Amino acid sequence: AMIRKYRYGAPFDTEALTEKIETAEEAFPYGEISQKEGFAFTYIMDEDDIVYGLGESNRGINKRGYCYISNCTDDPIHTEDKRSLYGAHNFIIVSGKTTFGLFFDYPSKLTFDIGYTRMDTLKVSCENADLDIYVIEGENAYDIVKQFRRVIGRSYIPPKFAFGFGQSRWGYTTKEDFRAVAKGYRENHIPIDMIYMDIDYMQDFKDFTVNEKNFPDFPEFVKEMKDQELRLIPIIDAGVKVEKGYEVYEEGVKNNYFCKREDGSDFVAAVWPGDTHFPDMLNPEARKWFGDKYRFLIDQGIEGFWNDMNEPAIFYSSEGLAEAKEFAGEFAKDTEGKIHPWAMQAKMKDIVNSPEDYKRFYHNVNGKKIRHDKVHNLFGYNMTRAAGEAFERIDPEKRFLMFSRSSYIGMHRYGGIWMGDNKSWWSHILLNLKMLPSLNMCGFMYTGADLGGFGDDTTRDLLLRFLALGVFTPLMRDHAAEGTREQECYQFENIEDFRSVINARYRLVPYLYSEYMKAALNDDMYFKPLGFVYPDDKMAIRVEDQLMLGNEIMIAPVYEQNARGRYVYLPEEMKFIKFMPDGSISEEVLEKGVHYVDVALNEVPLFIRSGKCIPVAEAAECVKDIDTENMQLIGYEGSSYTLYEDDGIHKDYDKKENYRVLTK
Amino acid sequence: AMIRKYRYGAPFDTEALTEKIETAEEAFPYGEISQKEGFAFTYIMDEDDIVYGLGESNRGINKRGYCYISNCTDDPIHTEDKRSLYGAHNFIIVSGKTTFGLFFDYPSKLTFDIGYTRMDTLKVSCENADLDIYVIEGENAYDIVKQFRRVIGRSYIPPKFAFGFGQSRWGYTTKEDFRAVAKGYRENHIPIDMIYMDIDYMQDFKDFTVNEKNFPDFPEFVKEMKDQELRLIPIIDAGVKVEKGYEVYEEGVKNNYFCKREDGSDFVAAVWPGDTHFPDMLNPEARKWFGDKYRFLIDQGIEGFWNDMNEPAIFYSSEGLAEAKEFAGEFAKDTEGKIHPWAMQAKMKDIVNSPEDYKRFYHNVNGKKIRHDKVHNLFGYNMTRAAGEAFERIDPEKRFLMFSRSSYIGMHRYGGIWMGDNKSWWSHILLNLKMLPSLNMCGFMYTGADLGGFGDDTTRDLLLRFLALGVFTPLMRDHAAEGTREQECYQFENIEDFRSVINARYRLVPYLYSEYMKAALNDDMYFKPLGFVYPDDKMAIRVEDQLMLGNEIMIAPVYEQNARGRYVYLPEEMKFIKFMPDGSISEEVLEKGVHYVDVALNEVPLFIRSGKCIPVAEAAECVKDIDTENMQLIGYEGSSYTLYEDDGIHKDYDKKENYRVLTK
């Protein structure tokens, strides 16, 4: 009764929602619907309206003034130019004099023109009128989000160790690479729980193998790491290498588990291993088979994974490569200047993640052949679902770490989100901040971004500022990609500043975990925009560079180079808190209003709300060793905090003993 | 006295300074000089030191924390990744407990590592120890700037009409195109003084021609425009088209005025016309010849120009094109998969502005051949000098509008700077703002940036905010480049908002021109960092998103999308002023300290300093029609302002009649 569902045509069943909603037969309640040239929803907005939503999408909290396309893609350009990121999160809320939420349950290319063409006009459009549109009513945006969170089902919950800090690098290959990382952190007493394994740990980039020469007794090495409280977290890619004798490949061909061309041959896309096939993630039998393959690593002591390249990414197809070679041949023998080098450059760019390639293969959905482009935004979702369901079959009571690159609403139940590569961009700290609440609205709470680097561009201060935001993001890792400067926390001058920043994370782990758990278990938000907490404050609702976390605190990271502080707006009285590099905590009461606050590179700030408190533990070097017995309470005298704690390993969420009232 | 020159090896004479300084004999006074690896200057900075300078370079006012390379280049990437912009402005100031200025008079690739490799270390290096280093002493940074501005000679002074507003588009090609612009502005009462003519006005991209089909009676059409106070401002490119019977080409060939390969053949570079030659800008006779060609346009009633592609840009050379086609044939025939599409992409990119190509041609300086890479950063500078010197021979009494893409210190005497293309990037509003004072320190005051757009990405609010900073920048124009959305002011909803912003510029023209003229004639800055004006205020010295203009005002543009205001810091009491859309001016006194100020999309903000006032004219539609007789004075009751005003056309600067004291 606060949710209606309007059905057009014959929508594909995405499983985004867990709750059944009856089909509405009355007029569509807002704006205008046109089925004239495909499908379009058009709404004229009031001047003061704010538009929230779109989860993993470009620009700010208020989405007005740009165009967003839901179309899972890895576009090799600066973020500022992107129409589309990796996620398709089709939920928006119009908030103003008239407030309502909309979820467009549609698996293919969906365009949100949000005041881009005409400032007062919101237009949502797609090529086929085959979708469900859910309309959600409420008295405010926050109320609407909670109703949405209920129907899409409980968010993924990670094991507690995943609330520690993790290091990786595209390039760690040998046992010695990993041993050096373990020594570097542990001997310098920098806290760490995880080391990520990028694609080089495989045999020739083959999913569900390990390099035999580099890791002859892999389970013993996993144990060697685990004995020092270091959990190895390996990558799994969408593409399965074409190679005779490789079991995964052989099984997939024999059992028709790969995506097929129109003639029924297995589609070939080049990725890391050269030629690959994609498992048919929309086929239930194929899903169960692919997910079951994770047993290979679980049986060796691995407790978490990440899924990558799962748009699916395509460097080129056999068809695209042939066209490119053909065109290059014309270029080569052109003497009359008919083919310009820039037409040559465009052709080469064009074969990567090509729209034409996405219509060259099909999914077998319960016996019905569906062209991939029609359901493109479901692929990464279904890959992560395959793994999640397999974990449930393997060990239904154990939590595994799991996160994905590509996603769609529904996937939030199975794993978290890798938000993107910040490379060495100062601009991206603020972009990460803005995206966090929007992701929470769509069910994705376990999220964080990479600072992959770019040449030597990651300076000491960029990393420290990035990590000080990372303190608060459930996924906190330092993982080099294109960066060539050594970027582990022990590789820079004045190592103590890095230790101070990571210490703050570990001191806050009990609180951050508690807040995550309470929010996940009650279908609520971890990060919130200020406007959700202070809806009557016209200043608060426009703030895009601070966030509320749980019900106790506000964050406001420094995101400018060479800055020694920043401006903040406090909507109520708050205690300005800083974790200091000597292990102390500075505290200052600041009244409602505008402030400039000082924040050094080695300082981690936050603000505790009036009438609230948080528990703070002493710094420990791993999650297991955190002393939660008698934590310091920080904030206002006389306040209480409800601490959630469990074993962090299993799914015994409903024990009364999980909850403890603390009082300052 | 306060400036010493240190000479290394045999430096090329760049003619950057007009003042002759003697070669010092003593040890270099700061840091360490090394010649082991070419040339290197190394300085250990105090933690609190700030580094100013580098004119047109990336990032902020404080240059610490990054690497900057002086190497004039058009790099086709997002600005955030750029090591090098279009200018080479080799002046830095170290400001702190120890303060000093350095000018590196070196015409080739010069690397500024300002705390990038190691946080406390400033390293300046180049391949060849053949340069002059000027050390400038002084009590503070501003004092050092003024010293430097004295010895480099007086900045270029534009005609007054160039302080109006200008519209252009890559694509205006017919009389009808220009007439529609004129009608679109004039019928809607939007002020304007200039229409730019991009490359389509030429006959087949040939310099010093006009398209014969589109402009058969060009003098008449120039007058048609001028009778409406619209001055046409055509572009000139560095590359002269290779074409039989084209007189500029034929004369360049016959008289050896083009840059040559080492064998003496005329070097070929492809740009807009296809194959071109580059005029040998460092040969004095070739300079005279090239500059004299501007007479063709001046004789038709043209009063200003812009020089472009003058790095010089090279799409490809004949040598690069052949290597590319050879590699393409290899790729085409590759059956064993040894040549990947990304190696082919890399090859196509590599032939554009190739460092190899810059080593392939030579300048002839009075018989002496010099390889272009050795003097690369002087090309645009000398092109603009050629035009500047020709104007003096053609009509010595008259000012001409002149600005350039590429530059080096010394060029500031001859023309202004086009700061770059913001495309449709919100991030570039702040980038523009930060660059302004640094350009001013190096002598370049007539400056502004473009919002050339990108597909349809320039939205209404972006253009409004861009124009509202543009109000204060001496070069103010709306010029579409890559943008495909119509972006003239009359092409959006609610034209009145665009009229309001542009009205604010025309009301401020007498003040802005006055301050420019005072600054230029006294070798002073037009824009200043807050720290230059409030050097004992610790907060003021770190402010980077606000500028002082002259001695009366402070500017603080809104640079965030969907923002309804912004934070500011006031180092003294000021009057916060806004030009309102109804033609009124609102005033509010704000005390020293931190404030949040409301600024709507259609409002132009500024602040008047305690004890100061400025004159504001009533809105007029062209510079000619501005009534400067009875302007209201805005600001503080006891105060006065010295107005500089001349005829805006000639070069009679000295006279007492140019000054009048206005008293509030």
UniProtKB/TrEMBL annotation, chains A, B:
Pfam families: Gal_mutarotas_2, Glyco_hydro_31_2nd, Glyco_hydro_31_3rd. Keywords: Glycosidase, Hydrolase. Residues 156-514 form the Glycoside hydrolase family 31 TIM barrel domain. It comes from the Bacteria. One of its GO terms (biological process) is carbohydrate metabolic process. One of its GO terms (molecular function) is carbohydrate binding. Its EC number is 3.2.1.-. InterPro entries: Gal_mutarotase_sf_dom, GH, Glyco_hydro_31_AS, Glyco_hydro_31_C, Glyco_hydro_31_N_dom, Glyco_hydro_31_TIM. SUPFAM superfamilies: (Trans)glycosidases (SSF51445), Galactose mutarotase-like (SSF74650), Glycosyl hydrolase domain (SSF51011). Residues 30-113 form the Glycoside hydrolase family 31 N-terminal domain. Residues 526-614 form the Glycosyl hydrolase family 31 C-terminal domain. Belongs to the glycosyl hydrolase 31 family. This is Glycosyl hydrolase, family 31. It comes from Blautia obeum ATCC 29174.
